[PDB]
Symmetry: D2
Subunit: 726 residues, 4 copies
């Protein structure tokens, strides 16, 4: 009986904000949050309270502290089957990690369409606005291992398993609308180039090394997704604040057999928001689990991640109406040309119970479609269809990975497939082949139809010779990079410049830097000059003369490509550091905390040690963490309430907190005497945009702060930060 008698070992089963309670398995945290998939997992959920400790064969263990030996200092005996079972299971706990997207964080939720999409697709899950479809989503990085850091610069995966009434549909996308290469045959070359180098296995979680930029310099098709990765897109604030995309053109097929080309989108209802590089990189050290943690705690708090599914739709007759090929996954479809039509909403509202069992074993694969969808000849998508089935044979130990509970369909599955390693299903069918008469030919094929029909591929015409040949329509590499560049704000552009400069600076062979610079000179000369200056490289007159690539279908920009050009701020679920002192002005804290609560913004109360401090009026303030324990990297803004500022004015950590927050462009608010900190960050007496200051935290102080928070960062501060030593 080792639990504390006060029951404080057990987190409350009610929504609680980040840091308030220990985190728990989703079914213990939020037992009343249900969906059909979560319910269907009950057959395999294993409890523990009130149960005897046993071997796996059900035998009660008396002494789980000792091996069986001859004498209490004697040798361990081979007949200790209890020891050997327990050590054997431990010795085999690991399975191979995913070849790519090894690092991922996942949650349960549901999806519902806004209205029936029957006119354009017979997919059952999109047929009725009252049809709720359970989902399991895993977000990920790409390059690093399962034990690598979350806030690296990388593409992010966004994979959604829809447990539909007519089968599993996996929408396996990323946080940018394109991919680096055109044809799946090159995927191991590209991935090998970005992954740690094979002699020494360095670097982890980074493209900032020779082989990646070598490959990019020799394969200009890469440049478009490289632009995305070098922008602040490569370092999202949270999985809740990035976009998702299927990348490829797929098809919707309706009941009448009409095909429409579609590209899939996820819009984050919490808005788009990213870190800045120095912050992101430092955060991989102070909290390598920041995104995993932030996702988990948002869900425990009730700030459920929500996304709107949208479709770019293109009629068949319009296949050839763009300057780029629809089947080229290095090309995006600009929303100015083809708008995203809202389809439905996905809400992630429960964490898993066991990460290994639900997250690590989950298998997503874009070939898992359902009637009412179909593929295209996109030669990247075509090769993906082969890989995601093949890879599970080692990763999940054989062909029965669909019987792993997280992977099971919630709808019926019956066929003539048998055996394989780990077979769970016990088939009673007299027949394991068809056609058969001995079971009256059951289970039976189903003709295609408007609903509940069998899958039939769209009868697309194929005409050509058998060739290993790239379509000439795919041979244009620069105009999409340029459209992306021209769509970014000036501060975004500067961050792109710095991302290339920083990465190429880690490339040891200078000629590779030079070749990358030359490629940039084919995209935009301003970009290329700015990166060249940072690398001490001088463009040639030839380079200064390269003619830019054409506009994309007459577009000189599209603001939907920018994180920030069109305001979409949402403060709910964000967090503020509050820097306490040993005699806080309690009226300030009351005003601050209640203002934050009313807008769904969380607070963490920080000090120079753990335990408690006491306010002017005697209110006892619980300390969440120390200045060093919970650095400004982990919050969206910082508030210093008034009180005995002398307590902390000389504290190096307290000062550095504000300097780090300041450098990374975060809103800072200072009440009463906290304004003496103005000198630490070099603010003028009359103050500046992005620093909130007043005699107290009453009146408009909290509104001014929340306004800054809704705009995310203080971009206007950028020219100020270069000279500050932080």
């Amino acid at each position: 009986s080792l639990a504390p008698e006060d029951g404080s070992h057990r987190p409350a089963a009610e929504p609680t904000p980040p840091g308030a309670q220990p985190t728990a398995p989703g079914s213990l945290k939020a037992p009343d949050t249900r969906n059909e998939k979560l319910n269907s997992l009950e057959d395999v959920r294993k409890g523990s309270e009130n149960y005897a400790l046993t071997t796996n064969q059900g035998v009660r263990i008396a002494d789980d502290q000792n091996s069986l030996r001859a004498g209490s200092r004697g040798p361990t005996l081979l007949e200790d089957f209890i020891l050997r079972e327990k050590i054997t299971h431990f010795d085999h706990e690991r399975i191979p990690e995913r070849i790519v997207h090894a690092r991922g964080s996942a949650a349960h939720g549901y999806f519902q369409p806004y209205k029936s999409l029957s006119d354009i697709t017979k997919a059952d899950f999109l047929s009725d606005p009252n049809k709720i479809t359970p989902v399991f989503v895993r977000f990920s990085t790409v390059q690093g291992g399962a034990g690598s850091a979350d806030t690296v610069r990388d593409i992010r995966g966004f994979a959604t398993k829809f447990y539909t009434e007519e089968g599993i549909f996996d929408l396996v996308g990323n946080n940018t609308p394109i991919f680096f290469i055109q044809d799946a045959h090159k995927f191991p070359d590209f991935v090998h180039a970005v992954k740690p180098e094979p002699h020494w296995a360095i670097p982890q979680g980074q493209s900032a090394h020779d082989t990646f930029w070598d490959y990019v310099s020799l394969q200009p098709e890469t440049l478009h997704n490289v632009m995305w990765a070098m922008s602040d897109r490569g370092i999202p604030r949270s999985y809740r604040t990035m976009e998702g995309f299927g990348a490829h053109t797929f098809r919707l097929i309706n009941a009448e057999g009409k095909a429409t080309f579609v590209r899939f989108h996820w819009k984050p209802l919490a808005g788009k928001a990213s870190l800045v590089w120095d912050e992101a990189q430092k955060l991989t050290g102070r909290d390598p689990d920041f995104h995993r943690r932030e996702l988990w705690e948002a869900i425990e708090a009730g700030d459920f991640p929500e996304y709107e599914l949208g479709f770019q739709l293109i009629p068949e007759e319009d296949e050839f109406k763009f300057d780029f090929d629809l089947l080229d996954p290095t090309k995006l479809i600009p929303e100015e040309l083809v708008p995203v039509q809202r389809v439905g909403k996905m809400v992630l509202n429960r964490n898993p119970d066991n990460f290994f069992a639900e997250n690590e074993q989950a298998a997503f694969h874009p070939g898992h479609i359902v009637p009412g969808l179909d593929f295209t000849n996109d030669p990247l998508l075509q090769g993906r269809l082969f890989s995601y089935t093949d890879t599970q044979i080692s990763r999940l130990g054989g062909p029965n990975f669909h019987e792993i509970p997280i992977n099971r369909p919630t709808c019926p599955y019956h066929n003539f497939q048998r055996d394989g390693m780990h077979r769970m299903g016990i088939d009673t069918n007299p027949a394991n082949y068809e056609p058969n008469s001995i079971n009256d030919n059951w289970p039976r094929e189903t003709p295609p139809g408007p609903k509940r029909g069998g899958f039939e591929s769209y009868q697309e015409r194929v005409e050509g010779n058998k060739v290993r040949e790239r379509s000439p329509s795919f041979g244009e590499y620069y105009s999409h990079p340029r459209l992306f560049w021209l769509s970014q704000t000036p501060f975004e552009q500067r961050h792109i410049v710095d991302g290339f400069s920083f990465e190429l600076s880690k490339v040891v062979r200078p000629y590779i830097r030079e070749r990358v610079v030359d490629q940039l000179a084919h995209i935009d000369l301003t970009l290329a000059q700015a990166v060249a200056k940072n690398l001490g490289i001088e463009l040639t007159d030839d380079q200064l003369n390269i003619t830019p690539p054409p506009d994309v279908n007459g577009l000189k920009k599209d603001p939907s490509l920018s994180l920030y050009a069109i305001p979409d701020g949402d403060v709910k679920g964000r967090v503020v550091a509050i820097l306490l002192n040993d005699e806080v002005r309690s009226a300030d804290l009351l005003a601050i905390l209640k203002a934050l609560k009313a807008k769904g913004v969380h607070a963490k109360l920080l000090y120079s040690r753990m335990g408690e401090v006491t306010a002017d009026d005697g209110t006892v303030l619980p300390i969440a963490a120390t200045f060093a324990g919970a650095p400004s990297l982990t919050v969206d803004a910082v508030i210093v309430p008034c009180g005995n500022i002398a307590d902390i004015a000389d504290n190096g950590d307290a000062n550095y907190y504000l300097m780090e927050a300041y450098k990374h462009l975060k809103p800072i608010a200072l009440a009463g005497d906290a304004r003496k900190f103005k000198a630490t960050i070099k603010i003028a007496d009359q103050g500046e945009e992005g620093i909130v200051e007043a005699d107290s935290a009453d009146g408009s102080f909290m509104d001014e702060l929340l306004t800054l928070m809704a705009a995310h960062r203080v971009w206007s501060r950028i020219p100020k930060i270069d000279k500050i030593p932080a």
Copy 2:
């Protein structure tokens, strides 16, 4: 629809004799035969009727006859995910077979004790005669692979998984009471010697080769089990008609902590019965699945295999009371010295639904004991404890093999072990370690006790140095061989002689046969001379003068070691071939079938073609098989009714039928004109013992027949069979 109109594709769900209906999975044949384990498999049992054919992901298939291709004569397309999933699962169906005992046949049943054994054991499944324990039993050969034949000369395995309330207990036995070797460390040597030789992988299912007899000749400890294998013990008639033994001394432990030495026995209630060598060998060609088929069909017929569990019990103070060591697994405990106490009955009453899922994947391990039992220092048993856990890691794919349905305890199992390939259980425990406070230390250890207690080892005293050394008390090799030899009937002795003779004639290196004959002369000179004579070897003067080994604790013999010395014949479930003609005397057949039914003996009606024949009075007689299709190898006796005997009297296959049955010592009955067949098998006009004959098949004729069938075979016929060319 493909089934026949008349519904004759589906076997009746009621007990039916062998051959009357097509065989079926157990839950469809016998859906109301229930036990707790069978019921608990319902979560994984998968039906088929009235379901749509789907992928494993739940997507309905429209056309299960064709690949997706560009044009009806075009190439197959990579995007055909239906084809690839179906082919992938196929391509991965096989798992490694068991290292040994790969060939085996299994069934569900239950065990129930005859009385409470709590005076001698706290094992919960033996605490009360109303305690019903579900079992799953797998019988097997040893040497051959999963695709080898049943009726080889080999040891047979007899493995019983007891699903108890306090844990899985696996009693992993064989059909002889000893093993070939003394120390687990030599197991790979002996098994490599007996298995197919490494250069060419010959022979399958046979010890009749150089390397086995080389090892035997150099390791005299093997000779006792080799005597067993060379006897008719090596070639059982049925898994229903052989004994089972745990071989090793184990311990029972009671509530007071008192230990009693125990050896386990299974006594077959259908009695003991074996084939003869020529019959067994020929049967591996005519029906390599004979034992598997016979077991499945007995259960289908209601002839449930039944066995009494028996204990030989030796008080701990009696450890040194014998002239052999109780821990030596090459020594048996004669029942004349220590009787078998009959303790309970096991009944095998339902076949599996899917052979691969339930039988092939079942894992039995003698280290799976429950409180109330314990091990001993037997150095063969000691090493077993290591192997049966270790082997499953490759065989069943990882450390979660207890989650494979057939292996699951039906009692609770909870502990802190996590992950591993194909993890099914999703743990909700906040803690995955103990001691822990965060889950109040649950699941918790349990002190040992009289019932529902944790497992504690019997605190046996260990004194000695760390040595790789065989106990001197194991160093006697001939006295147990001799006791077994002296306990056999004279015809059992002749068959042992012929076993050795036949096997040694297949040893190519003559010095090996000579060296084996030398070992026989250390057991018994009569045996050694008779084998030497068959091999064209003459014993030396030195060999004639080898003193026989001593009696075993004064025992001149022990009749419990013979299959036949003491009558235990049971005819229920045996089978008789009835050889039809195109005008059978219907009155004969009425009386035969009636008398057979009365004793639960089955019949197969045989002819020269399939279809039907018509009796003298118009009865339509359906033909089960041809003479060549269902050879006398497959039946216990042959009856020839009267009728138009001219029809068959010139049929070579009919005459050979009777020659073969006669050679193999089977009862033959001939009524009225069927006595013309006497001449093909050389029966004197006056008749002979084992040929039943009369004017018609009246009442005395069947009693005669059935009395012979109760004595199994006509051993007195042996001197006559040397003359018959068959």
Copy 3:
């Protein structure tokens, strides 16, 4: 000291007729036979004479007869690493058998073309009558497991691995010129149908059961290869006396890029010969290894299998 004085434990390293000597591993039986593949396998061959017995880590073993225990009648100790390494390797000896054609017998050999076929194919191994290409050939049945009988009625496989100077070419044939079914999608259905039935795993090595004839009766495309299987083709006397076929039309491509359709054949130079059914069936019982034995003994005798 264990071998006999007269050296009769060791087979003569020279061609001997079946039954004259015990059989032995190829490199010991016929150490003078060589080809380029066999030479290249030398880096992995391990001998045995005059070497100490060791663990897999190279530690010499003193006593390979006993486990380490506390007293000579005592319990076995967990620290016995020699026992656990040896038992662990034994525990994990088996690997999954082939889904189909699990039962099969194999030999090393060589191939040589009669003349250059450069006019119709640029395949290097067919370019020069002097070019000799090593092979490895495995013959098999189709239905039964690796431990099933040789002289069953079944299709036989005849698979040839050609180790050419421009890559491995595998010609993966059967002993009839067609197959039972038209489209690969149905392979698991047909193979499930002929394989032992799933409730009880019977029958081994035999198409003589309900599910096979159900599938055939419902799928007439199967009758052609069924005729062959039901003929004496389905019970060959020896792997040496059967034909082989690639079954499918493939292409030859010459240096000009001209494609020619091609079907592959193997002709047995020992001619064509089959058992009769009663003989074949009984023989599965009297010697289930008859074909594997006959192939190995032909090669030891110098009756080398030859195929055109």
Copy 4:
């Protein structure tokens, strides 16, 4: 067995002994060594019992455990001296 795929892990190049290794162990997944020994067991006469056990001794001897005295009952118990 799981991490490296089976019991031939000593054949993965990095793991191989540079000294002789010979024994009667056979097969396993990804078996590299092709054994030519007529025998895969001992004792064997067919290869004159080779490879052979080696007595322990000063150098190049077989492995023999130190014959430490063991005295105690079969217990799952922490030595009091560890407390």
